[PDB]
Amino acid sequence: ETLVRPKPLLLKLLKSVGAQKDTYTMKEVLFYLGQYIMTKRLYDEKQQHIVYCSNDLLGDLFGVPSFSVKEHRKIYTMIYRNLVV
Numbered sequence: 001e002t003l004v005r006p007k008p009l010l011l012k013l014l015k016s017v018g019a020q021k022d023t024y025t026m027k028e029v030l031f032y033l034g035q036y037i038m039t040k041r042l043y044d045e046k047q048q049h050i051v052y053c054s055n056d057l058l059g060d061l062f063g064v065p066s067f068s069v070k071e072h073r074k075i076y077t078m079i080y081r082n083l084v085v
């Protein structure tokens with residue numbers, strides 16, 4: 001629905017997986033973040049709901065070493081640290 005504005009570092013992350021936008025819906029941000037996690041194989045192959053990001057740009061942006069995709073409240077707070085509200 002509403003548009004969101006990634007901060008510069010998150011924008012570079014999104015573009016690095018082929019996004020060609022500066023302005024996004026939240027749905028699009030999640031779409032490209034998922035593609036980033038997939039393409040960089042940040043999830044554990046045997047526990048695919050767990051993302052390990054402590055040595056990746058994503059960890060610097062989200063401010064955690066790892067997270068579970070089941071933790072949606074936490075994921076939204078981590079994404080919003082990276083949006084210009």
Ligand SMILES: [Cl-]
Nearest residue numbers: 007008009010
């Ligand atoms: Cl930034």
Ligand SMILES: [Cl-]
Nearest residue numbers: 050066067068
């Ligand atoms: Cl975790």
